[PDB]
Design a protein around this ligand. Structure first.
Ligand SMILES: c1ccc2[nH]ncc2c1
Length: 219
């Protein structure tokens, strides 16, 4: 199946990404607390629902939240300000709180049921968000011996996510709060605060600049 692309809301960031975030890929955004990772996730959860000529995939969303940071009213605000019905957009986001890393891993396996259910509807799942990918792993696997154990568990979790992305033509978007370890995401984007309230994004193989606004993010 051909890759799809989802606009982030920012032409600058879309260009950095080669045209938007890709299906059949895991895109990891990482950066310090407050760098805008969750705002980008909220924006993508709206953008993916747009029709393709507007930068979406006519898609539905599954969201795994590990920090209680999902805000339904932020979805509704972004949707309304982009001309979409806020309640329809919110309804197309399946939402689950992950209580610990083992529950987070089960939830990814569980997500396959809804993905299959929706695959041939007019709004198949096209975006799976894990925010935060790493927070539970960081709190639970700590101390001597934890590096190998945590990396092995994360590798299995990411393998599960890669399979869903690749098998069902989904963009997986994950967040990671940071600041030597290996990573298995398809593409890693470093996000940081800049001057004038801007956020700056760099690929970790130019820089994109965007603002956080009532439309989510934009140039
Ligand atoms: C992950 C995210 C949202 C979800 N809703 N139901 C199951 C599930 C898994």
């Amino acid at each position: 199946a051909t890759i799809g692309r989802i606009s982030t809301g920012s032409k600058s960031l879309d260009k950095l990404l080669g045209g938007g975030i890709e299906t059949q890929a895991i895109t990891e955004v990482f950066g310090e607390f407050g760098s805008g990772k969750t705002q980008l996730a909220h924006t993508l959860a709206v953008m993916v629902q747009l029709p393709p000529e507007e930068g979406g995939l006519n898609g539905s969303v599954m969201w795994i939240d590990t920090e209680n940071t999902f805000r339904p009213e932020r979805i509704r605000e972004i949707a309304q300000n982009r001309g979409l019905d806020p309640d329809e957009v919110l309804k197309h986001i399946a939402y689950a709180r992950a209580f610990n890393s083992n529950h987070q891993m089960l939830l990814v396996q569980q997500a396959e049921d809804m993905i299959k259910e929706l695959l041939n509807t007019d709004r198949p799942v096209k975006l799976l968000i894990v925010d935060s990918l790493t927070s539970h792993f960081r709190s639970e696997y700590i101390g001597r011996g934890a590096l190998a154990e945590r990396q092995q568990k994360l590798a299995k979790h990411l393998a599960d996510l890669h399979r869903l992305a690749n098998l069902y033509d989904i963009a997986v978007f994950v967040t990671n709060q940071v600041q030597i370890l290996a990573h298995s995401a398809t593409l890693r984007v470093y996000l940081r605060k800049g001057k004038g309230g801007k956020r700056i994004a760099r690929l970790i193989d130019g820089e994109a600049v965007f603002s956080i606004t009532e439309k989510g993010i934009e140039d």
